[PDB]
Ligand binder design. Structure first.
Ligand code: TW3
Ligand code: TW3
Ligand code: TW3
Ligand code: BTI
Lengths: 532, 199, 532, 532
């Protein structure tokens, strides 16, 4: 009997209130800005580069991705803003590479395609980081990897940031070999001329598809003719590197779809499933509810009620540590444990979060974190020493969890609160931020005060005098730097926080992410010592 | 210390690991150890440098010494064969408790190893219960009643041990709480003779 | 019958030859430079900082490490040159932290100690990277971790490079929790005042030792008195964070030694062992044999003969692919498979290396790589397309190997050869470089030629003219940048390549590294698809 | 380097103090009483029964055990006081059965021998419980079981308490079959006439030894001649039940020793070992230190110092929750984690105990509990509601532990404190009590007060009057009953708390128990939800 009536979360907001109007206006402006920037990024490398690419008979990378995936299937692009203003004078739309998750022949796969229009497909450091992140996602979720290789190798300038280190270019081949050894299929489609770095990718792939004339695989470029040194006919017939021979881009994509079909893979789910139901409230009200000002506080229960199936939520320990919200819900019929922030973290909140995480790990339920850490303007210290003893517990419990974890940053994320609520350093399956989020070690004003106090004490101990003008001079740069570094676009330019998402699409993004992450089986969780 | 390391190595499955050596070796630098030894009432600071060849360069105050040697056993006695600044000598080495005993035909020297405070029981001494009998001997005289006011240097008891007279004297000016022995009793060495009232 | 006489490798070099004298002179100069720089780094943060640190009653970090480890036991310091000239005007001797492997109570442990004299123990990005590398080494080798915590938290400037990302500060707590969950003991000794970041470390540690007065654990510093907010007595008696109470530094170290003894751990070896024998030739001859000029070539068999037990080597496939040297030997009684470079890599060399790696993985024998990749001055292309088909095989075989792997760079390391011979990206247990090594994507001259050709063709296609002066102007900066970035000190300043080692100490360093790495059991190796 | 000097626990007690003299006198009286009662129990069933048993040519059970075990090896008898005054008029010395652990052919084995002199070997309910406890001990520690079967079957009166239920006689055969299936050897020596219940034991045993004339196995007795129905010759030659034929008792014991030698078993230890050292203080001082009055309190550190190797103890969290003592020590070279009571349990004590138990389980170290729970005379309530939230944590942690656990009750054990400190219900490997221990749900006075208050309130609610004489009349029986039921002999008569042990022999008993318990390997520990 699953019939039992259950109370539903959420309430109707007051549309006539001026606060709602102002918040809606600010959020709409932010979303419009994000949409226009994404459009410009989607434009590509440039007009002349696109014209040359089309003249060579090749397909644009987005067209390749559109033709590769199943008709009408949604595509979940990742890190669209990588490289946005990262370098002083060079423009790298999308980081020079395209990564995302889509369905090919009824199978969810991770797709990595080089954009030849951006610096001829050369690998910037951000490009390497983005590709490594995509490979790590695929390995964690056991998703087949498809590479649309068209690159000119590592960017010769800035080689030090791309070649040598562990997380540099060689990690790509390392991940390829490991995932191949773990029965995660690797498919490389040489859609254009590769280079020394590009050449190794098809070699390590289980299956290769090379275009007749555009495709050219040479371990070292001519700088002998390019076709003679490396070509589709040569690799297919004499060297044997190529596994399939394709006439053009469309034929290569068709062959890739066929190859994915004969993978002999069937997705099986461990968690229970229930029929999906839409939330009881419109998603666009989140604009008014949340707004763009971090000083004001909003109830996270509204956000939960607007993104869960049927707006049904079962709160756990409601009246203990009320600054933290935990409970059980279902998104698209998948069980989920929601952990959200409603204020400053205290000892009770940390203990409640630890208990909930233990329960979720025991029952093998995916976890979803909604982070809105608060500034210290309200409380200077509040005997934070008590928090340290209990904050760690949440940090360990979160780290040791083996269930699928997805983190969404809907507001500020500062200090150890970021680590506690499944920060980027704790390996969530996916991480997203809303356009109004702010992330940094501490608020700029707080940081400036800390630096000023340290200098005054040292100067006093030295006996030197700290001028009031000197203190003001020190504080102003720090405040500016922190404000600049905390921008969502600053964090998205670096491969941190995957990509920014419109709040109206949060439910769809979470559903797609959980559906992708459910491919891998859920392992048992082993916990360290609980410093009870 | 090197011998102790070898003893531990004997029982390990890894018997040839370079970590089991006592070379005290570092990468691109030399290890210098700050040791402290007590000669009589004087603390001596010795800076010992572990050389690559296996010798040691020791600096005491402003003088430097080149030291090399090894341990060998004759019968049941361990012997130290050492050369200091090119001068070679042999001596019998015994390390008991915190004292190093070196026996050579020139003479015998005792050196004390400082005892860390933590290992020393903290709050080791609270009160003294009268001088303890110098040895096991008959009590020949008692000069103190059950409750008597005494001043430091007031004789409390006289004891004869192997025909040698010892007079116990008052440690403090405190009044006597009690007496643990009477005349004619045989008192064992280091046994409390008098109890003093807590002040 | 293990008696059988066996031929020994190596030959006596000609001391009278002028080439030997010149090589010896150059290598001696390099080693003297390295030694003096290491001495200056060992000096510490500064005179005033050291005086203040001693006045506060604390012990200097090197004194702490000396008192912690067993008497006379060797200490293997790691990344002594981290932060060497990394930042423009700030000096960070040793990266602000000290890491190494030593024996405590007869157990090999990884020690991480903060140097309070360097910017009050604040964490620079290089400091975080060094600590993460040490933690990764300990996790891979299953070594107990000991933390001598005395830090001021993250460096407030440059916060963006320390807080947010995955490999940033939070990864420290993540690794701590994971290693605790995997039964790898964590011990934290709070030897001085910590901060918000520092406070979490003792909380996550299994056992804590805090000094009575110097030790102060507060989740947030005063900027209430420091002792009242966080102190040894408070944490031991009321908050309960502290597990042991120490009077001073010596008492804390003694307590740490006792805590390690009661770990109830016994090291057991899987590989067979034989009595250790010294090599038949002096190690100092390596100076003359190798020299400092990368253009000249030397036989790697000499280096092998001067670092193996008894100079006994069993070459495998000697006459096939002679540019690569492979065989079996023993160092300090441990079996090892040596893979060295004697010239340019070819298809036969790649196949031979793949076969040898498969054999070593099957027999569970540790692997040692000696890299001396050659410049392309001798051969412009040599149909490198053939190499691509077979180079990958080695790259995969190396990546999939599960046996303990140690890489030593005795010369140049360029291009895909670095990846093939177990580069830093392929997770060797340890990586070391000699003072004369050079690492980069390609030789500077070769790179400049590649860039010039690309520009000329593009300009010609545009119809614009590429001036000869313009080509020269482009080439000169590239050559200078590559030469600067290829310095061993440049690579060591970043946490790549762990530390530089004197060639005379190669045998001792390798023995210590293998003894440390043998703690963990050797797992089975699973290989991906071999593109035979 | 294990040569670090370490401080030693314990202090020299004041022998001249009158309190020491009084405590010593009381403890000496208790020990003398225990020794004389044990002597009388060892006397056996009776003079006439012993004379008849000897006249039939058989050996007395204690002589059988003495001849069976290795020469001079110690024997650890269990539950010597079972059945002591358990039944109103029937005397059952030792419960009618003898159980213990001894070394046979260098192997530790559990020996169960029926005493034919006590009611012709009939099984009382206490006899069945004792045998089941011995079998459970053997199964837990993986010790071979040897049965010296000489019994007349179940006692026909009191059949309801012996036949029907789960823990009744059939559980003997169930345990025999299970332990045989788990490769724990079962050996049955039919030294005398068995019965229907006795007959099944040899049938289920892997190996049987039956004496030529005394041994008679019949599924149902004559009440045909006994020898014809069941006899050594018949069972050996025609029925085939017997596996070996023995001329007399000595021959049967020799054959049993040979059969054990032929077991092909080797004991291997998982925990590390160190050379054994005696404690620094005499054990007999425990008489004066502890005394016989439970009202006075003594420092458990003295007891620890008088029973550990070298009096070396490493206290853990000394100043937090000081009412509970935890630390690491070694008994006969085996590592052990000691958890002792020094006063009333509080929240801090419970948390400290939970942390220590987690550490011990993680490191795979045996646990030793010393229980001295305190009466509530000092504190009526002390807001015990706080204790409930944290007491449970210790109760769960203790229950889920998989390491060898041994509990020793040196004083009072009341209320939930018994459950927290590894009570009999939580399956310790062994449980012992000193002669001065007291165990019950609560102190008699406290219980009487609780009952009186309940009646007064109910009578008041009814409106009936509770007379002061009535309250006194209710209280006096309750106080008497609790005092009687709390006697150590009352608890030992029932198979609870194995046997009483002289405090002077505590070290030897613990060493033997741990040596026996180390036979089985130590499994991993899985914990439930920590409430945190
Ligand atoms: C893994 C390991 C271990 C090692 C290696 O991988 S070592 C790899 C060495 N690389 C090559 O050997 C490829 C050399 N390219 C070529 O052979 C071609 O160029 C193609 C193939 C790239 C197609 O491109 P194309 O030729 O069709 O067009 P083009 O406009 O010329 O393309 C843009 C122009 O390339 C310039 N450019 C700048 N940096 C690079 C760069 N790193 N690689 C290539 N080109 C670059 C760009 O600055 C200019 O345009 P701009 O910036 O002036 O507007
Ligand atoms: C993990 C997460 C999630 C968040 C966090 O962790 S947020 C952490 C916030 N940090 C603090 O809250 C510690 C504030 N310090 C102090 O309270 C003390 O200072 C101590 C404790 C550091 C002891 O040091 P001290 O006081 O004994 O000596 P001092 O010489 O003063 O020490 C050097 C002086 O510190 C200056 N300095 C520069 N940068 C920093 C820095 N990042 N932290 C500390 N000090 C810094 C240095 O520039 C100057 O010397 P200089 O460069 O002028 O020569
Ligand atoms: C498992 C299942 C599923 C079922 C079963 O097991 S159904 C088992 C049925 N039992 C028998 O079928 C054995 C019947 N005994 C005999 O055949 C013998 O007796 C022997 C073999 C016992 C040897 O003993 P014995 O004959 O050498 O000497 P005896 O002195 O006679 O021994 C003492 C005397 O036995 C009396 N006595 C009281 N209760 C019993 C009892 N339960 N069993 C035996 N004897 C009992 C005792 O009261 C008197 O002495 P007392 O108390 O008067 O002083
Ligand atoms: O009593 C033991 C021998 C030494 C003391 C004896 C004294 S000496 C003075 C006197 N004259 C003797 O002959 N005997 C005692």
């Amino acid at each position: 009997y699953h019939g039992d009536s259950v109370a539903s979360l959420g309430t109707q907001p007051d549309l006539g209130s001026a606060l709602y109007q102002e918040n809606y206006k600010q959020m709409k402006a932010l979303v419009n800005q994000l949409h226009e920037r994404v459009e410009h990024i989607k434009l590509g490398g440039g007009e002349k580069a696109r014209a040359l690419h089309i003249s060579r008979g090749k397909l644009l990378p987005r067209e390749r991705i559109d033709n590769l995936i199943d008709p009408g299937s949604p595509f979940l692009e990742l890190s669209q803003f990588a490289g946005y203003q990262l370098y002083d004078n060079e423009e790298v739309p999308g980081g020079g590479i395209i990564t995302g998750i889509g369905r090919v022949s009824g199978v969810e796969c991770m797709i990595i395609a080089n954009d030849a229009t951006v610096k001829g497909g050369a690998y910037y450091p951000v490009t390497v980081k983005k590709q490594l992140r995509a490979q790590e996602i695929a390995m964690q979720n056991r998703l087949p990897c498809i590479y649309l290789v068209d690159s000119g190798g590592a960017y010769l300038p800035r080689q030090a940031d791309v070649f040598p280190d562990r997380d540099h270019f060689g990690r790509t081949f390392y991940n390829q070999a490991i995932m191949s050894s773990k029965n995660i299929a690797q498919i490389a489609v040489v859609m254009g001329s590769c280079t020394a770095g590009g050449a190794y990718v098809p070699a390590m792939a289980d299956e290769n598809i090379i275009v007749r004339k555009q495709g050219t695989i040479f371990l070292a470029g001519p700088p002998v003719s390019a076709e003679d040194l490396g070509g589709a006919d040569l690799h297919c017939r004499k060297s044997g590197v190529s596994d399939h021979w394709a006439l053009d881009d469309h034929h290569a994509l068709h062959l890739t779809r066929k190859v994915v079909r004969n993978l002999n893979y069937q997705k099986k789910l461990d968690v229970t499933i229930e029929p999906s139901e839409e939330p009881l409230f419109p998603a666009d009200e989140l604009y008014g509810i949340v707004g763009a000002n971090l000083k004001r506080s909003f109830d996270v229960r509204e956000v939960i009620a607007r993104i869960v199936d049927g707006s049904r939520f079962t709160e756990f320990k409601a009246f203990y540590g009320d600054t933290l919200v935990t409970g059980f819900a279902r998104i698209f019929g998948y069980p989920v444990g929601i952990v959200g922030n409603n204020g400053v973290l205290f000892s009770e909140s940390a203990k409640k979060g630890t208990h909930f995480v233990q329960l979720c790990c025991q029952r093998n339920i995916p976890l979803l974190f909604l982070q809105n850490i608060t500034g210290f303007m309200v409380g200077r210290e509040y005997e934070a020493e008590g928090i340290a003893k209990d904050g760690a517990k949440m940090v360990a419990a979160v780290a040791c969890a083996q269930v699928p974890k997805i983190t969404l940053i809907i507001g500020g994320s500062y200090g150890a609160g970021n680590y506690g609520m499944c920060g980027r350093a704790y390996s969530p399956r996916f991480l997203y931020i809303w356009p109004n989020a702010r992330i940094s070690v501490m608020g700029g004003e707080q940081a400036a005060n800390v630096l000023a106090t340290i200098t005054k004490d040292q100067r006093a101990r030295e006996g030197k005098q700290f001028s009031s003008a000197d203190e003001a001079a020190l504080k102003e740069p720090i405040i500016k730097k922190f404000e600049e570094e905390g921008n969502p676009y600053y964090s998205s330019a670096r491969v941190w926080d995957d990509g920014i998402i419109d709040p109206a699409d949060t439910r769809l993004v979470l559903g797609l992410s959980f559906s992708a992450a459910l491919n891998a089986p859920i392992e048992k969780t082993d916990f360290g010592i609980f410093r009870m | 210390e090197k011998a102790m390391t070898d003893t531990f190595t004997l029982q390990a499955h890894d018997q040839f690991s370079p970590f089991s050596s006592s070379s005290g070796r570092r990468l691109n630098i030399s290890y210098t150890r700050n040791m402290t030894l007590k000669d009589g009432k004087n603390n001596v600071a010795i800076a010992v440098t572990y050389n690559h060849d296996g010798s040691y360069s020791m600096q005491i105050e402003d003088k430097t010494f080149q030291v090399l040697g090894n341990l060998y056993s004759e019968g049941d006695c361990t012997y130290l064969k050492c050369s200091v600044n090119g001068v070679a000598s042999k001596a019998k080495l015994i390390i008991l408790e915190n004292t190093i005993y070196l026996f050579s035909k020139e003479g015998s020297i005792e050196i004390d190893i400082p005892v860390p405070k933590y290992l020393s029981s903290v709050s080791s001494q609270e009160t003294q219960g009268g001088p303890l009998a110098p040895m096991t001997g008959t009590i020949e005289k008692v000069f103190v009643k059950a409750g008597d006011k005494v001043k430091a240097g007031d004789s409390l008891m006289v004891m004869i041990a192997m025909k040698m007279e010892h007079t116990i004297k008052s440690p403090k000016d405190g009044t006597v709480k009690k007496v643990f022995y009477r005349e004619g009793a045989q008192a064992n060495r280091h046994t409390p003779l008098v109890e003093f009232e807590e002040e």
